[PDB]
Design brief:
Blueprint lengths: L1 H17 L23 H6 L10 E6 L5 H14 L4 E5 L6 H7 L7 E3 L4 H13 L5 E5 L7 H4 L6 H20 L2 E7 L5 H7 L2 E13 L2 E14 L7 E7 L3 E2 L1 H11 L4 E3 L2 E4 L2 E5 H11 L1 H15 L2
The chain binds sodium ion.
């Protein structure tokens, strides 16, 4: 009785002294912001607690080569644009496929792109963009590619981490004020991510778990994402979803998964049913049905959000 108040007091002082998400019980509900950047998977949006990526914060998305981390980033870009936002993409990798981006939903024509000469030029340009107040989202591809000028110009070793540290402490204020989200893509956490690990409000570990198949042909990959860090909602939640080659994150696939998870979609055998109606036999028909019938896919989306507050 007398200790329940001391803990509430303790938590409050921590909250006041260090910020809103400085301590949380893992069973807590998330405090919902006004706006967020949805990820493309409702499952991931739920895993993040606040229904998507936070605004005015640093995000890290890391994983192996071709884990899907860039696909997740590009979906964040599409949704930011889809709600009238402007996007930028700081590219030190030169791997971007705009056609793939296009099929996800990215307005590539409007997408600001920069291919900077050095790591510090990359971060300075990003910061220049962020302070404009005009961007909703900027993506940095990638952390490891942010090679310092000195190293590129042929000149001890350790200053890439120092470059990130310096840049992030300056960038973090610019992001809060602007309400711009910065997503750092990072490989396997790798060459400056040790500062990013503490500056990031969200960190997402992205991985392939199995190849999806249409008979013997590889159509895509089931993808798993763990929110290892989350300052806006309890951390350590994970989600799975499908990335289909040439299309990206199957929005409809996630609606079904979370649909059955939430009891909104029942399962009379291999038949997925919704509201007395039938959606399809097997996952693909249920999936294909939802894209062909966008109105019911939004019905299922609104219902899932209502049950969880997302
Ligand atoms: Na790409």
């Amino acid at each position: 009785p007398d200790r329940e108040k001391a803990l509430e007091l303790a938590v409050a002082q921590i909250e006041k002294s260090y910020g809103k998400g400085s301590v949380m019980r893992l069973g807590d509900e998330a405090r919902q912001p006004i706006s967020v950047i949805p990820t493309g998977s409702i499952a991931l949006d739920v895993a993040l607690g606040i229904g998507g990526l936070p605004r005015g914060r640093v995000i890290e998305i890391y994983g192996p080569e071709s884990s899907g981390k860039t696909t997740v980033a590009l979906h964040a870009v599409a949704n930011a644009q889809a709600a009238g936002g402007v996007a930028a993409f700081i590219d030190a990798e030169h791997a971007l496929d705009p056609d793939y981006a296009k099929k996800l939903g990215v307005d590539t024509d409007s997408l600001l792109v920069s291919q900077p000469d050095t790591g510090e030029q990359a971060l300075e340009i990003a910061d220049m963009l962020i302070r404009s107040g005009a961007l909703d989202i900027v993506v940095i591809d990638s952390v490891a590619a942010l090679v310092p000028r000195a190293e590129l110009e042929g000149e001890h070793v350790g200053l890439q981490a120092r470059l990130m540290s310096q840049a992030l402490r300056k960038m973090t204020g610019a992001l809060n004020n602007s309400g711009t989200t910065a997503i750092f893509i990072n490989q396997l956490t790798t060459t400056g991510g040790k500062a990013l690990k503490f500056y990031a409000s969200v960190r997402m570990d992205v991985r392939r778990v199995e190849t999806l198949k249409d008979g013997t042909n590889a159509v895509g990959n089931r993808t798993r994402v763990k929110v290892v860090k989350n300052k806006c909602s309890p951390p350590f939640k994970q989600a799975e979803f499908d990335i289909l080659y040439g299309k990206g994150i199957s929005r409809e696939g996630s609606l079904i998964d979370m649909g059955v998870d939430q009891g909104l979609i029942r399962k009379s055998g291999a038949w997925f049913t919704y509201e007395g109606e039938q959606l399809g036999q097997g996952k693909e028909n249920a999936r294909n049905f939802l894209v062909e019938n966008a109105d019911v896919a939004d019905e299922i989306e609104k219902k899932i959000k209502e049950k969880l507050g997302i």
